């Protein structure tokens, strides 16, 4: 029998930094001690929230449209600013620009939050232009996008990813930008997404009882392949 050896408590070596507290790995925090009377769990009630289940993934929120650099008043510079709230006019000639600006994720309310949370990301971005005109107004508008561009200057969109918008019943037009960068993941708050330009293709037509100019709204969201990766410090403070 093992009576040739005196019985003893197990001896173990304690690794470096015992007592060190890891506030980075979730696998570490979830295992923390419980101040609960019996280290028990509670029964959650989604109904009171009107939901059938909790919200598990945040990416889905990044996939929700939000106005770009939204303002109370339309672009007072013929749309050459970041305001995603500009006017299209009977006055503007074809090839004239109704909007132009360099796009960044922070220009979007929902996205700007992730920009201040995660350090990198990847995936396609979707922009939806909604022109609110009357049933009589007609015309076309081509909006292109040069991925990764930086020179904020009007330029032919023949080689850019563009979408021609013909006014009808569904006056909301989408444009997808697939992920385009040297790196596999890209800074959330780094290099611009590219040059966004919406040029006039065919003058907005009208009649005696219809407006000679209409309002437009530009929204932005992440694609179904969107992803965010490293959480980083904050660059701004919300309220």
């Amino acid at each position: 029998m093992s009576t040739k050896y005196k019985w003893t408590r197990t001896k173990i070596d304690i690794a470096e930094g015992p007592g060190s507290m890891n506030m980075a790995n979730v696998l570490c925090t979830t295992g923390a001690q419980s101040v609960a009377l019996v280290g028990e769990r509670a029964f959650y009630d989604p109904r009171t929230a009107g939901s059938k289940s909790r919200f598990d993934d945040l990416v889905k929120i990044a996939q929700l449209f939000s106005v770009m650099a939204d303002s109370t008043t339309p672009s007072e510079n013929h749309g050459v600013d970041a305001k995603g709230y500009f006017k299209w006019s009977a006055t503007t000639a074809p090839q004239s620009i109704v909007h132009r600006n360099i796009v960044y994720l922070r220009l979007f309310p929902n996205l700007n939050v992730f920009v201040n949370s995660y350090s990198y990301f990847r995936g396609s971005l979707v922009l939806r232009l909604s022109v609110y005109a009357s049933t009589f107004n007609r015309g076309r508008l081509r909006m292109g996008f040069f991925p990764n561009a930086t020179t904020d200057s009007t330029s032919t969109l023949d080689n850019a990813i563009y979408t021609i918008c013909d006014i009808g019943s569904d006056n909301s037009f989408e444009i997808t930008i697939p992920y385009s960068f040297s790196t596999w993941m890209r800074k959330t708050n780094g290099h611009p997404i590219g040059l966004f330009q919406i040029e006039v293709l065919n003058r907005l037509t009208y009649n005696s009882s219809s407006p000679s100019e209409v309002y437009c709204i530009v929204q932005g969201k992440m694609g179904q392949d969107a992803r965010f990766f490293c959480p980083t410090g904050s660059v701004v403070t919300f309220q």
Partner: protein, 96 residues
Amino acid sequence: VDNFHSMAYDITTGDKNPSKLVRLETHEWTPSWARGYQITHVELPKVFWDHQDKPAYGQSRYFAAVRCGFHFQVQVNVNQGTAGSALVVYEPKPVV
């Protein structure tokens, strides 16, 4: 139960009456108004008992607690010549 139905209504009419659809508010949008301006708003849920002429006003009086679901129908009519867009959104107490 009146077998002759001198009242041709569903027997549970009076019961469901308070859940009936009602006019909660009306307002005239002014053309001058800027984007993001608040057109109109309705206190939820006390608005369904807005006046003593509300089907639900009766019962609502005899109870202090309420748990209900809503079905809104915001209506805005404008001739074809005109254009524009409004944002109809529900704002829980947290948002408000």
